[PDB]
Design a protein around this nucleic acid. Structure first.
Lengths: 116, 63, 143, 200
RNA sequence: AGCGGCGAGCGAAAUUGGACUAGCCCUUAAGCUUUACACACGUUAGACGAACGGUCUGGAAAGGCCGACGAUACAGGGUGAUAGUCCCGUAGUUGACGAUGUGUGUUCAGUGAAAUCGAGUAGGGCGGGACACGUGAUAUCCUGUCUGAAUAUGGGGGGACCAUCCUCCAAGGCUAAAUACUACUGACUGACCGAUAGUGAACCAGUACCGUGAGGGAAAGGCGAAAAGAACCCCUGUGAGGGGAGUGAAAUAGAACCUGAAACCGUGUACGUACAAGCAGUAGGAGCAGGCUGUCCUGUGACUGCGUACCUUUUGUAUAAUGGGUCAGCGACUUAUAUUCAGUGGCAAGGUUAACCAUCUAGGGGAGCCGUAGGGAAACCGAGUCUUAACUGGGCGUU
RNA sequence: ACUCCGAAUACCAGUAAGUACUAUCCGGGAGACACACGGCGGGUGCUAACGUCCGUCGUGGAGAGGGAAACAACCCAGAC
RNA sequence: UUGACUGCGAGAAUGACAAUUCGAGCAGGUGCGAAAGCAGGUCAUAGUGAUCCGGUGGUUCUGAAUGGAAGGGCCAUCGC
């Protein structure tokens, strides 16, 4: 039997085109360009799911360093202090505390200083 | 169609239970210079090495 | 029940379909590799061709001949003599039993299996071992 | 085995014929063969060679800026050949004689166990009248049934034609698919004994 | 088996299973053709041809619900949707004046026919060709050339050749069936196509068109159930086109007409965007706008990090190497046959039938093939065999 | 392209522990037979070449991630 | 003096394969040696050429009615 490809052929093309909504120009209109676009978006999305974890930790460390140095200790010394004090609060939390509860951060800094 | 036998292969390679049997080369002419030992040891027919078989079998589809 | 029948597990296997994308694992080249004669349509190499070195089917000598008798001769197992209907095992009775084809002229009976009946083998050759077994089962070997 | 004939006493039958285990792989193969047996295989497409025209090279190999063509009836080209054009096929499959009989026995056995084989003493229709046969069937409380007799009377053949899902078949004419296809199989006791000999 | 730069390849017969069968004459046959006379026998226009209401949905009922009814007829088609019962049919039953065809006799007039049993013949030499057979040790056949018997006490063949034996009687003829094919006619069938497919051609197609010509060779189907194809009015050029009105179930079914995708082009709305540098996204993220009710959803996306398409081909491509303007459609590991390996099933030291027959997927049909023994070039021997004078042996096999 | 001498390594074999589905054999299916750079030992070249030819090990090829500004082949390290 | 032997050959070396190499020992027949012994060419490692076709000798295996024969085979050997 002879198979016509139309109906399924369109469904594939449409799937990709729907994933390419919002891209500029051909990249949202034309299957050949959109496909390439939706692939590279997936590639970037894979790479960035990893690199998100790096970017966020850099941000926290930068913020903790700011707060520690306002409380008279370097980031490097503060982490050592906390380690020596057996305080296992993550950088994500520390950095949250540095913004939202400055006093608590200072306590932790004072604890850290004592351990050093 | 039916596979044809390579009659060249057929006339040189005979299937036995012990594998494809063949006549050793270098016992046709220019024998004076050869040793009787060498000539004697070539006289018995031999069985083909494993590497030589696959081809022969493809040339001898009915053997 | 026509909607309930199904093949045995292992019985049916989907054929290999080359050139239907990456996921199949047979896309693009279709398992032919990259370039060369063997990748080309109609690009097979004759079995026995060895790149132009004198092949094995020519560097080795021809040997032997075919006897004509070989072509009209047939070994018969002693066990097959069972299939014969009647006491007399002859060329006609062998042919009737389809033990030998109708073009057979010369038969040797060989010691393979056992004879359980008394048969008189006329006209055929028998092995010492088969003769013994025939004679042991109360047969004769006529000349 | 014993089969409960209606209007008579139970019929002794071979356990090999009617008590065999149901080999689904055997039955599936024979059923599939049968269906392939039905195929006609009458089709064809034209290849590049068989389509009209296409002798002349469309344009010169080099210079035009176009993709090289040799024939307007290339399978690449609209209106061109089918790369691998069909020609009429024989979809027939060999079934071994034992494999056919084995399947047939398996099927009859499974019919028995499923209470689809209905052994009647006799099954005759007096006139060639559909209306009569429908009645007879209603006595047996079956609408969809294969009716296997030893020989098919004209009357029963004629009475069954216009009925759908009612076929009148002689023991000779029973097939692996029909035994499966019809909801019940009404056999006359004579036909049972005939089927037994037929299937070994 | 053989043939074969013994390469590539080519490829029998004996014998055996079938289908169909038939032989008859040169002292003149069988058959064939004609001719009429009969008779049969069929075809060729055709005819009749069963059985359904109500209700519901709907533009329409063939659909649904309810209850009936025919069926030797539920093939198939049509009818405002999907019909056994509305229609045409179908099953079945009938019909040919005349005209044809067929087969029998019974005739006619021929033909067969070469007359009279085979001489420029068989055979030979030279050159070729055909036979599976390539000139080979090459039988047989045909014969361009040159020759040339015997003549049943004879002659041909039996694969160089000779003997013996067997078998046949060339140099004259005729002969059905089983076999091949289908442009044409009819019927029927399809795990064949369904408008880029199927014919080149569904349509006024071998047309248009191209070519001096031979020749090449398209594209192009679909309003609706019915034209009911839009009276009349209005703008306009007594236009084109449109808006009303009307038709229709539907008029974004209005003839540029079913559905009506994508590329591509517009109008509107929200958000962004005129200090900003690159594969245009991605991870994050403010603000704004819609919803829903702000650790929601949707759209947009200032700003930050990261980030040189795809394919191909390559040691290696962002590559300034190849290919692609885009979309839609189509476009590439098939089919047959045989060999082998694997899985699966059947049966099992057995397994299996082929053509063909058949009341035809059954069943017959055993020819054959594979397995059941190997060794040896082979004769041949054989659970052994081969080697050799023989193996202390050794090769292969046995299990 | 000399040797009165002469290692390290490597290889061959044996014995032995522990770790490891290893080694081997017989079949079905391939692909490949343009390699690149880097280290080490060399020939060739100019102890030139992103040169060329071998040996051997690594990586690339067929390998992403981090480093080396950017950088197949370097350093670190193997992405369900 | 003819061991530059004839039949074989445990067991190895070495090769993609074709092929190439070494070999104790066994049988037969032999030479040298008083004898143990040694001898299947040469101190060793180059001195070579597959297959087909064909020639010569032997064998008498095959050989298409039979008996022969031709022609095949097998053994030895020749022709690049």
């Amino acid at each position: 039997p002879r198979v016509k490809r139309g109906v399924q052929a369109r469904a594939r093309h449409k799937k990709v085109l729907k994933q390419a909504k919002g891209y500029y120009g051909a990249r949202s209109r034309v299957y050949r360009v959109a496909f390439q676009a939706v692939t590279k978006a997936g590639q970037y999305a894979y790479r960035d799911r990893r690199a998100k974890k790096r970017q966020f930790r850099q941000l926290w460390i930068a913020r903790i360093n700011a707060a520690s140095r306002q409380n008279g200790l370097s980031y490097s010394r503060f982490i050592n202090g906390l380690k020596k004090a057996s305080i296992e609060i993550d950088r994500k939390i520390l950095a949250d505390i540095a913004v939202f509860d400055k006093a608590a951060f200072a306590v932790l800094v004072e604890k850290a200083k004592a351990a050093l | 169609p039916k596979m044809k036998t390579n009659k060249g292969a057929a006339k040189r390679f005979k299937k036995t239970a012990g594998g494809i049997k063949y006549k050793h080369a270098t016992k046709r002419h220019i024998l004076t210079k050869r040793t009787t030992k060498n000539k004697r040891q070539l006289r018995p027919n031999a069985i083909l090495p494993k590497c030589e078989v696959a081809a022969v079998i493809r040339m001898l589809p009915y053997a | 029940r026509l909607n309930t029948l199904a093949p045995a597990a292992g019985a049916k296997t989907s054929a290999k379909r080359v050139g239907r994308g990456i996921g199949s694992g047979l896309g693009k080249t279709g398992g032919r590799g990259h370039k060369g004669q063997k990748s080309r349509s109609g690009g097979s190499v004759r079995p026995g061709f060895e790149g132009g070195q004198m092949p094995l089917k020519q560097r080795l000598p021809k040997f032997g001949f075919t006897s004509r008798k070989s072509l009209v001769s047939a070994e018969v197992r002693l066990a097959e003599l069972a299939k014969v209907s009647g006491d007399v095992v002859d060329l006609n009775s062998l042919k009737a039993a389809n033990i030998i084809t109708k073009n057979i002229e010369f038969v040797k009976v060989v010691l393979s299996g056992e004879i359980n009946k008394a048969v008189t083998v006329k006209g055929l050759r028998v092995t010492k071992g088969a003769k013994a077994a025939i004679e042991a089962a109360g047969g004769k070997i006529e000349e | 085995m014993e089969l409960m004939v209606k209007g008579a006493d139970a019929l002794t039958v071979s356990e090999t014929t009617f008590g065999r285990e149901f080999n689904e792989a055997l039955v599936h193969q024979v059923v599939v063969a049968y269906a392939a047996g039905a195929r006609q295989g009458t089709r064809a497409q034209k290849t590049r060679s068989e389509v009209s025209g296409g002798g002349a090279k469309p344009w010169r190999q080099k210079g035009t800026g176009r993709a090289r063509a040799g024939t307007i009836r290339s399978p690449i080209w609209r209106s061109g050949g089918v790369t691998f054009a069909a020609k009429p096929q024989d979809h027939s499959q060999k079934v071994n004689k034992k494999m056919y009989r084995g399947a047939m026995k398996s099927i009859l056995s499974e019919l028995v166990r499923q209470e689809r084989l209905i052994v009647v003493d006799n099954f005759s229709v007096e006139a060639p009248k559909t209306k009569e046969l429908v009645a007879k069937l209603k006595e047996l409380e079956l609408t969809d049934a294969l009716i296997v007799t030893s020989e098919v009377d004209e009357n029963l053949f004629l009475a069954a034609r216009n009925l759908y899902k009612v076929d009148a078949r002689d023991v000779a004419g029973i097939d692996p698919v029909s035994l499966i296809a019809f909801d019940k199989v009404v056999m006359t006791a004579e036909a049972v004994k005939q089927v037994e000999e037929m299937l070994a």
